[PDB]
Design a protein around this ligand. Structure first.
Ligand SMILES: Nc1ncnc2c1ncn2[C@@H]1O[C@H](COP(=O)(O)OP(=O)(O)OP(=O)(O)O)[C@@H](O)[C@H]1O
Ligand SMILES: [K+]
Ligand SMILES: [Mg+2]
Ligand SMILES: [Mg+2]
Ligand SMILES: [Mg+2]
Lengths: 629, 379
């Protein structure tokens, strides 16, 4: 089993693995170092990753992207519209009030939850990795934005499980980049020495994260993290597309807003113009037949682009100033500012980040790979079998969390357990006096400090098996309260004390209610995913066998006329030519859309004759070499 | 301070550095792992790399590329004279040394080929420096195996102008071989064929390696195949479909063919990693939708002669080397077109199923080996 780190991006995902010397980037079937984060659907199979993207423009209503953003998303969330404006496919409410996609798939209308959809993508990308490693992949570390909710982390972890993976940790993405910075740099401060303070700024397709960390050799602590989840590349593409939507109404008398397909072509072209504007100060905008017969031909300057995103840019320094305040630092205490993420290549962003810290920007990591590499390192930490050079890290726990219990004989019925601005993972030990079985729960101490519309309650438990000793008043229960390496709030142990010495008596049973799926539901979704996988694989295999047959026809026909010509009788050759011709015509008829066994059989008939002739050819070839030596 | 390895390519360049036991290929500030060997001159500024290449169509006379074809050559070189016919920029004669002539900042300026190349090398150097965080001063630079002393020395001069100490000028197929560790196999001669197809240009090289010592046996340059011709085959095929299905001929329609061609370029690329590809052109001709598909096997067959022709320089190289195909021990694939399955299939079937060294990105394998070699020469 080889450790596997997944940077799951809104636009693209990066795959890293821990092997040999260290950590490698896994390349996909098209040779790309990232894979488009796309799940599409067709009449026969799913289009996942690169193929999803290939089929996207001709299948927009059945192509889901933004997989990350709809995980855990309430359908009536006040900011739902900021998410759904970026969707081309139909979104629907699920039975639990969350959001799914409705899609035409295999001749039917299908509804899939965001968890399910993420699982399909994780499954594809898991197959990329095992194709590359030739090994078993059973464990993942998934990197997510620091603004991911407790619920969302559970949801993405369950998506991993539906794809047949153990989600070893769900890590904050910029923390994973910090880990890769810490395991790669060779001159970090060592003893009583002052930590190196490095600010990280990631701006991707959808999110802007700033996270400031203290580094010593073998360790990091995160000091402060702030996010704008509504600040990314897609917001730039959209501002460009809306600018041109208005310009083309006047210039061409066309209204792309009334024509989803036309609008999507401009949107796609707008990302490319955006990228040219990171390198050039001016750029032409040309799109052929955006509608029936209409070719558009315009341009945009960098200056014009900057004015287009003026409202967004008003927020440009906020994550920096907020992360510094959390860290309790002034800008001058930061030693180095590292940028990652594709959108940090926009010059106006670079200027603003530099000015906010009053520092030049450092680019000493691979910006596309750092998060994935750190996630693969973290997956290796959790491996029981792969010993890795040790690195310790703590992440920030931004909100106060309390636990409550049945009052019973206790004076208090709740307490603050995990304070605001502490670190995770963390373990706290409590002992409570108990009259019998009891309920517990974890909650946010001050809900005004959380995003709007966050439920106060995080999780709840029933503890049972409480038995009072003879002195039948109460019994002390020891509890192990845990904020785990993913920042999830658990209870991992509860037991009764004293059965001169004070020993343990009974291990107690804990029933947990979390955002995580039940075993029953999980297994039902695992089954659905296996069925869709088997169906995709059958279609890909039958497609392969049909291509292999067609290629063999042209190949064997050509050889019979050339190097095989001396090696077949008249009767053998014309017979084989007849069946080659018949097999070729069949590929246009019944064989246009046939079953796997038949493409195989048609091939074996031909090859069985072809190989007799090839055999004679090869034998005379070795004979020429026998005459040599 | 690490030394860097630079593939100074005719169309694109690539820089890597050996660090922590491995080669890291370095992305430029646009995130690209290769950088166009382009230099543009405008009224106000000089542009190098992606910026230069982005504005070529709008400033074609002042955007210089292919300086590699001129470097170390004489003006009266029939190659120089021949090549000129294809460039939209001006090439002049300065005491039998070619200079590229350009408008820069409202003035006429001429540059030696090695001056243009120094600007590309300065760019690659700055890319390496941004990634490393310190000044870079030592480099291995690669050239084609067929480069003479003058072409090698002019490339070294470009290095020196760019502020680099040039540790060594090494052959490109030698670099690709070092990338795959073919120089680690101890005593005894191994014959290696490097097959380098990509970006119109085509070089086959046979090297002999013994105890990490390289000798060039042959070089064969069939260096124009790969672009429009494969596209033409798909356009003509599909024009014939529309002819068949709708009883109408779309041939004499400029916009309609360009639209069909675009779809054919996309389909071709898809067919390198999938066994089929769909085409979907709304209102292609006279308001008619053209939705169809093509298999990888069909496409290969349409282009069977164009693919088969890649073996010509292989057979030529084997002749110059005086070797039989069974005497080639090792195969190395470099250049983007070697990703095309048929290229791999033809080659592999020609050499009777010999394995291919191909796991390193074929656009990066040369910078890869130059970086390994630069580290060796430093320590
Ligand atoms: N040179 C460039 N100039 C401007 N933008 C760029 C450039 N290169 C890439 N981008 C943009 O960066 C985005 C992809 O960046 P990245 O891979 O960091 O996103 P992601 O991880 O998929 O998104 P997120 O982290 O928000 O979920 C795209 O919107 C892309 O257009
Ligand atoms: K990414
Ligand atoms: Mg990202
Ligand atoms: Mg371990
Ligand atoms: Mg040897």
């Amino acid at each position: 089993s080889t450790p596997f780190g997944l940077d799951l991006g809104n636009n693209n995902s990066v795959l890293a693995v821990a092997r040999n010397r260290g950590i490698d980037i896994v390349v996909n079937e098209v040779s790309n170092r990232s894979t488009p984060s796309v799940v599409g659907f067709g009449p026969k199979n799913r289009y996942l990753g690169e193929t999803g993207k290939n089929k996207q423009t001709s299948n927009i209503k059945n192509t889901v992207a933004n997989l990350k953003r709809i995980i855990g998303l309430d359908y009536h969330h006040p900011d739902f519209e900021q998410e759904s404006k970026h969707f081309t496919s139909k979104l629907v409410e699920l039975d639990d009030k969350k959001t799914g996609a409705e899609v035409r798939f295999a001749g039917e209308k299908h509804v899939f939850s965001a968890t399910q959809l993420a699982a399909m993508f994780i499954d594809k990308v898991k197959d990329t990795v095992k194709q590359d490693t030739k090994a078993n992949i059973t464990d993942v570390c998934i990197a997510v934005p620091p603004w991911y909710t407790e619920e969302q982390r559970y949801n993405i972890a369950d998506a991993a499980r539906i794809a047949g993976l153990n989600p070893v940790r769900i890590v904050n993405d910029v923390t994973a980049a910090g880990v890769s910075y810490g395991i790669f740099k060779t001159d970090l401060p060592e003893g009583e020495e002052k930590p190196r303070i490095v600010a990280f700024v990631d701006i991707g397709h959808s999110s802007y994260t700033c996270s400031i960390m203290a580094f010593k050799k073998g360790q990091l602590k995160v000091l402060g993290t702030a996010c704008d989840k509504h600040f990314g590349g897609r917001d730039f593409d959209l501002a460009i597309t809306e600018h041109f939507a208005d310009e083309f109404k006047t210039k061409y008398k066309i209204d792309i807003r009334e024509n989803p397909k036309a609008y999507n072509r401009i949107l796609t072209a707008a990302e490319k113009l955006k990228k040219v504007l990171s390198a050039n100060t001016n750029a032409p905008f040309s799109v052929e037949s955006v509608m029936n017969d209409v070719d558009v031909s315009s341009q945009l300057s960098r200056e014009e682009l900057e004015e287009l995103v003026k409202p967004l840019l008003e927020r440009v320094t906020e994550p920096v100033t907020k992360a510094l305040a959390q860290a309790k630092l002034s800008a001058e205490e930061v030693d180095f500012v590292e940028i990652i993420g594709g959108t940090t290549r926009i010059p106006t962003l670079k200027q603003s980040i530099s000015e906010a810290f009053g520092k030049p920007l450092s680019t000493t990591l691979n910006q596309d790979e750092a998060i994935a590499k750190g996630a693969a390192f973290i997956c290796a930490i959790h491996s029981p079998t792969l010993r890795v050079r040790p690195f310790k890290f703590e992440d920030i726990h931004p909100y106060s969390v309390s636990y409550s219990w049945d009052k019973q004989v206790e004076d208090e019925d709740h307490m603050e357990v995990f304070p605001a601005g502490s670190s995770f993972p963390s373990t706290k030990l409590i002992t409570l006096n108990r009259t019998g079985d009891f309920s517990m729960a974890a909650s946010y101490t001050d809900i005004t400090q959380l995003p709007p519309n966050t439920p106060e309650q995080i999780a709840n438990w029933e503890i049972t098996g409480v038995q009072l000793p003879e002195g039948q008043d109460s019994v002390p229960v020891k509890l192990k309260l845990r904020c785990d390496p993913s920042g999830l709030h658990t209870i991992e142990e509860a037991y009764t004390i004293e059965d001169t010495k004070t020993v343990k008596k009974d291990d107690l049973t804990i029933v947990a209610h979390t955002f995580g799926l039940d075993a029953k539901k999980l297994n039902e979704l695992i089954e659905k995913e296996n069925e869709m996988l088997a169906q995709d694989k059958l279609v890909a295999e039958t497609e392969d066998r049909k291509n292999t047959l067609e290629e063999y026809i042209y190949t064997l026909r050509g050889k019979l006329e050339e190097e095989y010509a001396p090696f077949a009788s008249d009767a053998e050759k014309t017979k084989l030519q007849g069946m080659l011709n018949k097999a070729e015509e069949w590929l246009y008829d019944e064989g246009f859309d046939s079953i796997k066994a038949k493409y195989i059989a048609k091939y074996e008939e031909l090859a069985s004759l072809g190989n007799i002739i090839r055999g004679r050819y090869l034998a005379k070839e070795e004979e020429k070499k026998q005459a040599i030596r | 301070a690490a030394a860097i390895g630079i593939d100074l390519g005719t169309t694109y360049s690539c820089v890597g550095v050996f660090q922590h036991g491995k080669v890291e290929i370095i992305a430029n500030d646009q995130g690209n792992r290769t950088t166009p060997s382009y230099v543009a001159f405008t009224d106000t500024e000089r542009l190098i790399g992606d910026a230069a290449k982005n504005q070529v169509a709008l400033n074609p006379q002042n955007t210089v590329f292919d300086a590699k074809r001129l470097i170390g050559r004489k003006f009266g070189d029939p190659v120089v004279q021949s090549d000129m016919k294809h460039w939209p920029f001006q090439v002049i004669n300065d005491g039998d040394k070619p200079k590229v002539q350009v408008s820069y900042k409202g003035e006429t300026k001429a540059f030696y080929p090695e001056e243009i190349s120094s600007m590309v090398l300065t760019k690659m150097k700055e890319i390496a420096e941004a990634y490393l965080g310190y000044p870079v001063t030592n480099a291995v630079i690669t050239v084609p195996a067929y480069f003479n002393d003058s072409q090698r020395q002019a490339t070294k001069d470009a290095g020196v102008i760019a502020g680099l100490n040039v540790l060594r000028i090494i052959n490109e197929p030698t670099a690709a071989a070092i990338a795959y560790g073919l120089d680690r196999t101890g005593k005894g001669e191994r014959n290696v064929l490097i097959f380098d197809l990509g970006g119109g240009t085509f070089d086959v090289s046979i090297l002999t390696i013994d105890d990490g010592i390289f000798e060039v046996k042959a070089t064969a340059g069939d260096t124009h195949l790969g672009g429009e011709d494969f596209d033409n085959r798909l356009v003509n095929h599909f024009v014939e479909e529309f002819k068949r299905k709708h009883k109408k001929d779309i041939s004499q329609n400029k916009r309609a063919v360009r639209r069909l061609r675009t779809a054919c370029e996309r389909a071709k690329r898809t067919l390198s990693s999938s066994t089929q590809a769909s085409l979907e052109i709304d209102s292609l001709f006279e308001g008619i939708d053209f939705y169809t598909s093509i298999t990888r096997a069909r496409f290969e067959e349409l282009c069977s002669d164009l693919f088969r022709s890649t073996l010509e320089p292989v057979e030529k190289a084997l002749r110059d080397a005086k070797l039989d195909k069974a005497q080639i021990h090792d195969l190395v694939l470099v250049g983007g077109s070697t990703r095309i399955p048929k290229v791999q299939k033809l080659l592999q079937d020609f050499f009777n199923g010999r394995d291919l060294n191909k796991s390193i990105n074929p656009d990066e394998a040369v910078a890869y080996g130059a970086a390994v070699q630069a580290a060796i020469l430093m320590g």
